[PDB]
Scaffold this active site. Structure first.
Site, short mmCIF file in Angstrom:
data_model
loop_
_atom_site.label_atom_id
_atom_site.label_comp_id
_atom_site.label_asym_id
_atom_site.label_seq_id
_atom_site.Cartn_x
_atom_site.Cartn_y
_atom_site.Cartn_z
N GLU A 11 51.23 83.19 -79.19
CA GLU A 11 49.90 82.77 -79.64
C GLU A 11 49.40 83.57 -80.85
OE1 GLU A 11 48.46 80.22 -78.55
OE2 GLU A 11 49.52 79.78 -76.73
N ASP A 20 43.80 75.57 -83.86
CA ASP A 20 45.15 75.68 -83.32
C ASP A 20 46.08 74.55 -83.86
OD1 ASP A 20 44.56 73.39 -81.77
OD2 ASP A 20 44.76 74.42 -79.91
#
Ligand SMILES: [Cl-]
Ligand SMILES: [Cl-]
EC number: 3.2.1.17
Length: 162
Positions: A11, A20
């Site tokens: 991440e 994202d």
């Protein structure tokens, strides 16, 4: 290596609001904030999560704090899910980390839907599971990460992360 280091690799860490891979507002170590297209909405959700007026920026500790909660919530979600729990309980420790990563990424719901892969994993049919897991939108959208997590599940080792 462990779950935390694993997801921190997958991440990354960003201290300011970002979008994202799906275009959604997120912050920290993959902490999704909202699916809404409004930056303000994202900002509202961040301040509610942190407990203060952040203005879209948090510190490293705050990011880690949210990550801790998120990892914890991922495990607890597995443990409360009737389709997930038994898979999870049957696995060894490294492979369990693969399942937590998936759930963190896609939610309990999404993962509980990989019916076939789940059964092969439960049966310890590694290579078959790996092939099945790759036949998914998940893998076609984020193939590098998907590969690492799939190899983790297939081999029970952390090689993909060295
Ligand atoms: Cl929260
Ligand atoms: Cl990827």
């Amino acid at each position: 290596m462990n779950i935390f280091e694993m997801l921190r690799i997958d991440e990354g860490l960003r201290l300011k609001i970002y979008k994202d891979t799906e275009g959604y507002y997120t912050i920290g170590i993959g902490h999704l904030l909202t699916k809404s297209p409004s930056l303000n909405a994202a900002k509202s959700e961040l301040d509610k999560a942190i407990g203060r007026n952040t203005n879209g920026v948090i510190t490293k500790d705050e990011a880690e704090k949210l990550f801790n909660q998120d990892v914890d919530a991922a495990v607890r979600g597995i443990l409360r899910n009737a389709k997930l729990k038994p898979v999870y309980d049957s696995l060894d420790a490294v492979r369990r980390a693969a399942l937590i990563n998936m759930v963190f990424q896609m939610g309990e719901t999404g993962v509980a839907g990989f019916t076939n892969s789940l059964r092969m994993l439960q049966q310890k049919r590694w290579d078959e599971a790996a092939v099945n897991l790759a036949k998914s939108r998940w893998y076609n959208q984020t193939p590098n990460r998907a590969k690492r997590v799939i190899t983790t599940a297939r081999t029970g080792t952390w090689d993909a992360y060295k």
